[PDB]
Paper text:
A potential workaround to the size limitation in cryo-EM is to bind a small protein of interest (the “cargo”) to a much larger carrier (the “scaffold”) in order to make it large enough to visualize readily. In the present study, we demonstrate a protein design advance that substantially rigidifies a cryo-EM scaffold based on fusion of a DARPin as the modular binding domain to a designed protein cage. Analogous to antibodies, sequence variations in the nonconserved loop regions of a DARPin protein can be selected in the laboratory in order to obtain a variant that binds nearly any protein of interest. The rigidified scaffold described here provides a number of advantageous properties for cryo-EM structure determination—size, symmetry, and modular binding—making it suitable for future applications to many important systems.
Before employing the candidate cryo-EM scaffolds to image a protein target of major biological importance, we compared their performance in a test system, using the well-studied superfolder version of the green fluorescent protein (GFP), 26 kDa in size, as the cargo protein. When bound to the imaging scaffold, the overall molecular weight of this complex is 972 kDa. Initial cryo-EM datasets were collected on the five candidate scaffolds with GFP bound. Based on data processing of similar numbers of particle images from the five candidates, one design (designated RCG-10) appeared to offer the most rigid presentation of the bound GFP cargo protein. Following data processing from ~877,000 particles obtained from 3,575 cryo-EM movies, a 3-D density map was obtained in which the resolution of the central core of the scaffold was 2.7 Å, with a resolution of 3.1 Å for just the GFP component. The level of atomic detail is illustrated by the density for the GFP chromophore and side chains from the neighboring amino acid residues. In order to assess issues related to coordinate precision and potential perturbances caused by binding to the scaffold, we compared the bound protein structure to crystal structures of GFP in an unbound form. The binding of GFP to the DARPin did not lead to meaningful differences in the backbone, though a different rotamer is seen for a tyrosine residue (Tyr39). The rms deviation for the GFP displayed by the imaging scaffold compared to a crystal structure is 0.59 Å. For the new 3.1-Å cryo-EM map, ModelAngelo built all 156 residues of the DARPin domain correctly (100% success), including sidechains. For the GFP cargo, the program built 220 of 231 residues correctly (95% success), including sidechains.
Residue numbers in the entry:
A (entry chain A): 155 to 322
B (entry chain B): 1 to 64, 68 to 231
Write the structure that this text describes.
């Protein structure tokens, strides 16, 4: 039928968009977006093009996808948002862009980690400062009761621990 | 050594294949996911594909990849798993449950194609029929544990031992003592770590769109113990 053919072609377009976003082809991403691909498409595990673009550090693709209507607060099977992946990867510009566009700064994954938790765990000072600028909760606690200061102090991070101590 | 470290410099797909029999019952679980060795992140999903699993899911968490554990820059010399990866290693496990049956586990971890494959063989004996395990009396959660790794100096492997504490639905803790030993497969010099330990965190979830026996797992692992 025409309906089934339309659905199959749309699914092929969504798969092509996801592959292009993972690979980092901005031209193909824009071309597929113009042709009618779904910007909110997801895998079987719930991973969206914004997730891959933010995790792999494609700033231009992230900004292009934001202007089309990509949900900036979307969780996969493991409860991660694009801000979580961007903060744990260490991309400062994508984190800043997500925060400006209105990313939730106090979202929690399946373990209760916040973006500040992952920023302290990975060991990026600039991301910690940027997240604290926009109103991150220093005293957040995960399921096991650990705090972003504890994760910093027990992982060998020194300057991040000092900053978190100053922030109280 | 350095080649294994260079291998784990990004997101690596992970395939896990387990087949086993406990008290005669037969099952085989297939799992797929991704791992990030830079931060110790692991995101996996497991399916039973043979019906209903005869045992509670958490009991198989420790059996279902030590090479994706984060090691700080001052501990890079104590990374045995990455140093022996391109060919893989062999894990022998004895899981003695408290006042219940035991598990014997033989696994091989190899790097095939672009993916990392963990192949496991299980054998469970002496389990009761009204007990927590075979009676399905364990709840859906997982705690955090410390795994102590020491050297062997004779078999080019390492030794480990720890205790998993499960949670019964009646407010009780069941203690499963795990004994482990790792041996290399390929014939090449590998790093032999000093005595240290690994800290672990896990979170078990559920997929609302899967109509089978599934288990979603998110896991973080790090190394500690040594001061530099």
């Amino acid at each position: 039928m025409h309906a089934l053919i339309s659905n199959k072609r749309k699914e092929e377009l969504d798969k092509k968009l996801l592959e292009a976003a993972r690979a980092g082809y901005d031209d193909q991403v824009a071309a597929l977006l113009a042709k009618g691909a779904d910007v909110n498409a997801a895998d079987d595990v719930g991973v969206t093009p914004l997730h891959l673009a933010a995790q792999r550090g494609h700033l231009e693709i992230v900004e292009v996808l934001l202007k089309r209507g990509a949900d900036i607060n979307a969780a996969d099977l493991w409860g991660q948002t694009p801000l979580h992946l961007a903060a744990t990867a260490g991309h400062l510009e994508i984190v800043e862009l997500l925060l400006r566009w209105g990313a939730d700064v106090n979202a929690r994954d399946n373990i209760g980690h916040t973006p500040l938790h992952l920023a302290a765990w990975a060991g990026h000072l600039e991301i910690v400062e940027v997240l604290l600028k926009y109103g991150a909760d220093v005293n957040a606690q995960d399921k096991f009761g650990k705090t972003p200061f504890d994760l910093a102090i027990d992982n060998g991070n020194e300057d991040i621990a000092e900053v978190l101590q100053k922030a109280a | 050594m350095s080649k294994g470290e260079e291998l784990f410099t990004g997101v690596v797909p992970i395939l896990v294949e387990l087949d086993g029999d406990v008290n005669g019952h037969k099952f085989s679980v297939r799992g797929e996911g991704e791992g990030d060795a830079t931060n110790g992140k692991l995101t996996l999903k497991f399916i039973c594909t043979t019906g209903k699993l005869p045992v509670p899911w958490p009991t198989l968490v420790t059996t279902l990849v030590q090479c994706f554990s984060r090691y700080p820059d001052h501990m890079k010399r104590h990374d045995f798993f990455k140093s022996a990866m391109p060919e893989g290693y062999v894990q022998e496990r004895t899981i003695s449950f408290k006042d219940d049956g035991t598990y014997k586990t033989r696994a091989e971890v190899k790097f095939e194609g672009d993916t990392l494959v963990n192949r496991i063989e299980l054998k469970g004996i002496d389990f009761k029929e009204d007990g927590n395990i075979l009676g399905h009396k364990l709840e859906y959660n997982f705690n955090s544990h410390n795994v102590y790794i020491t050297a062997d100096k004779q078999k080019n492997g390492i030794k480990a031992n720890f205790k998993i504490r499960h949670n019964v639905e009646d407010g009780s803790v069941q203690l499963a003592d795990h004994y482990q030993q790792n041996t290399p497969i390929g014939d090449g010099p590998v790093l032999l770590p000093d005595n240290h330990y690994l800290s672990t965190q896990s979170a078990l979830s559920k997929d609302p769109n899967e109509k089978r026996d599934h288990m979603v797992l998110l896991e973080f692992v790090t190394a500690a113990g040594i001061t530099h």
